[PDB]
Amino acid sequence: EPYKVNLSQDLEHQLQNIIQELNLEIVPPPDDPFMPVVLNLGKPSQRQNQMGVVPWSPPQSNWNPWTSSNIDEGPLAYATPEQISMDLKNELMYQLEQDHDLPAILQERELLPVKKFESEILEAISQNSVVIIRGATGCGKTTQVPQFILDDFIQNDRAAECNIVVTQPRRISAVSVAERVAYERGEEPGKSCGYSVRFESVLPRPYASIMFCTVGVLLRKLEAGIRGISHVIVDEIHERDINTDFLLVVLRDVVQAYPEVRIVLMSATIDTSMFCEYFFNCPIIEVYGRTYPVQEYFLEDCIQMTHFIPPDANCNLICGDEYGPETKMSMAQLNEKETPFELIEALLKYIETLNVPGAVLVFLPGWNLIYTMQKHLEMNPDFGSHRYQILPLHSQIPREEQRKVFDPVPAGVTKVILSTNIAETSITINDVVYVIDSCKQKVKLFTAHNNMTNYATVWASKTNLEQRKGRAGRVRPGFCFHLCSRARFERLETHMTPEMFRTPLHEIALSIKLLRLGGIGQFLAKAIEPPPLDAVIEAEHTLRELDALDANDELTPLGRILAKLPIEPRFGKMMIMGCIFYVGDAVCTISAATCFPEPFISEGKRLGYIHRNFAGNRFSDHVALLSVFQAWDDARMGGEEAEIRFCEHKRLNMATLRMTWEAKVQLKEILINSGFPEDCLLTQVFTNTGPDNNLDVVISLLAFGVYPNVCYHKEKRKILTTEGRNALIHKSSVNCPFSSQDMKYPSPFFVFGEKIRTRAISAKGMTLVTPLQLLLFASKKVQSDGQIVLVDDWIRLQISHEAAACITALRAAMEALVVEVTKQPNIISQLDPVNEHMLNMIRQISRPSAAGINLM
Ligand SMILES: Nc1ncnc2c1ncn2[C@@H]1O[C@H](COP(=O)(O)OP(=O)(O)O)[C@@H](O)[C@H]1O
Ligand SMILES: [Mg+2]
């Protein structure tokens, strides 16, 4: 049915006024009501590109490669190469004397399997422009190889001819390795070992250094070029992170046009053919250590040797003959869509019976299943405090709490690790004798025309199960407990689909064009494994649609801003808009918070009472998050203990808030550096109960940014998608009712943030909006019949024709002004009166009073 949209009469008077002042014409009402006239409107191009290459140069005196700038004051700034080489050679032998715990550790370094091969490696790397270092996970190629390379260059007095960039796919890997390698050198991060992840960096010195960054960070610094670098180490290639696959394309163009450069690809035990063939049949340096085999078992065997009982074709129904009558009878009572918490619980205390000491590594998909499984054991008898030691490893936990997994345990105690697939190839634990495998992955599923980053649990590869097994048996003959039928193993993929095949490419596309590497399609066609066509088309369509590219597929001044922002391009455009309305700080804050988990500490079930009160009366998860942020930033002014007090009292995660903050600041600086003034990015206090026109527009711009994640409320926990299918409220949301209950809303229009798919479908992080916001920013294709209005062809609205089409115009005028200010962002100071009245009209229609709503 439609919605009874009740505007004022003198408001409609205003919307037609401004539209006249802007010298634009409203699409007239249909003569025949059955004619579905569309309200949408629409509206210099630049010369095209040619296939080009990122420039390279080796390390230089008076050039910091980590700040990508000159240095005209200090020892190195003034000194000569040999001076530095000599000096630094001495510093280490000075250090060698005086530190009495350094050689304590350096011996530990030489016990690592990769130690053996140091000669062969350095030998290969020297004589070949590209190298692959294949070897098992645990040999120590991550930590050691970049040292081996530096150590050598130091003690041949070529220290200043050495700068190493080491890319890691995960944020956590980059930093924690940087920490480890700096420890193994008797230092703290900053001396010779730096890092650089998204929104956080501890840079090293300009010479004889090692930089551990993420691929995205490196890619966005390549506008300056790969200047002042001797070696480029691309670790964990076998993971097939889409950004690594992309980087490899870039690097291959480099090694052609600059063969002096040195590249080092590092991989687990997989087929490295395509990589070797890609890089001109480059040498492979195999690496291996003394490792023990493992008996692996499957979900038949697990139930066999515990006597367990619980309360696409199903593979649990299929079972072997030699397995007993009760074995089958049990397993078939348990679907494969969810992993059995109850079985693995019983499977742990079977390991007791084997009476062999060691740690059990449990593979699960996601924080959700790890945090539940933890509270399943820890808050349960048998599993006492002094019997078992249950450590989680999400990569979303304090980095102190991560390290626990490595250091040993008091004797007669079992160390249980509930980790993600980080521990599959990225990190190795020492005590691991046993492994339990969910045989499942957590992947963002996003195909063409989804426009929804949808997290979904899926089956792992045969290769995955193989690699998860090998974690057991780095100490003694081990055991591996696969929680998948023997039938389900047969119906598994051998390898998993690489990210290139199943990820958006609009971020990759902006990069391509910023770096002037040629055409989006042409470039990705050179990939080790190119993406599907429709993905490239979708990426191209998507960037054109928001004027990041012209129709000639070249980078507009807007797209450049979006290229320099390290966030989703829509949120980048949302921020630029907010700057124009002088709500830049507010809207950057929301952007930043997308890059981090929710700062609420949910004990389980749904949300609590006190947390929901941050929402206010705007029925918004986004305002909940924005309200805590205001309360936190005010409370932090007390001091360190005052900050944590607040957080402890309100049950908030203090780490998350400091990260969202630091990210907000960094976003803010890119806009400042882009030319936007300071005054449009100042902190602006707001209420979440009274009226707030600053916060009205901020909700409006959130409608834009999060489009097209829209829904409509009907029943208590029922909502309907944009397409029309039936979805739910997530239990974390503030707009979620309590069990059985319901709540009325001043509007059923919600722009939601994210959608999970594990048990069913559901929407997460919901924010209420008015009809006018839906029309103005959260709806592309809209049709009028004179009285009734159709929005994105599944949402109907009873409303004036002239007003509905006057709004769709403002949008088009706003988009025009976006273009205008992206040519010169300092424009927003001296805005012509027509423009500033267009911003006030938008401000007006943002409010709920103008849509016949009040929040009480
Ligand atoms: N933070 C750490 N604390 C203690 N030991 C560590 C740490 N990081 C790595 N190790 C140890 O270093 C060894 C090699 O690690 P790494 O260089 O990551 O290997 P690779 O990447 O080749 O699998 C492993 O045996 C592991 O136990
Ligand atoms: Mg590694």
Tab-separated table of N, CA and C and ligand atoms in Angstrom, residues 137 141-142 168 235-236 266 425-427, ligand 2:
chain	number	residue	atom	x	y	z
A	137	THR	N	54.337	-23.271	6.227
A	137	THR	CA	54.038	-22.234	7.196
A	137	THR	C	54.650	-22.617	8.540
A	141	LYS	N	59.817	-17.630	7.045
A	141	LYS	CA	60.233	-16.806	5.922
A	141	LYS	C	59.723	-15.376	6.100
A	142	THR	N	58.561	-15.212	6.746
A	142	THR	CA	58.021	-13.887	7.021
A	142	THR	C	59.012	-13.067	7.845
A	168	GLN	N	51.708	-7.316	3.748
A	168	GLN	CA	50.954	-8.378	4.396
A	168	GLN	C	49.473	-8.182	4.075
A	235	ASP	N	54.311	-10.996	0.756
A	235	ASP	CA	54.160	-12.220	1.524
A	235	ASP	C	52.755	-12.775	1.295
A	236	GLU	N	52.585	-14.070	1.580
A	236	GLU	CA	51.275	-14.698	1.656
A	236	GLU	C	50.531	-14.531	0.329
A	266	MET	N	56.546	-14.783	-1.502
A	266	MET	CA	56.680	-15.806	-0.479
A	266	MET	C	55.341	-16.526	-0.317
A	425	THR	N	47.748	-20.089	7.791
A	425	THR	CA	49.044	-19.857	7.163
A	425	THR	C	49.728	-18.586	7.679
A	426	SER	N	48.982	-17.697	8.348
A	426	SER	CA	49.486	-16.371	8.675
A	426	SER	C	50.325	-16.396	9.955
A	427	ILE	N	49.970	-17.285	10.891
A	427	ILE	CA	50.565	-17.317	12.218
A	427	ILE	C	50.701	-18.772	12.654
B	2	MG	MG	54.178	-15.898	6.693
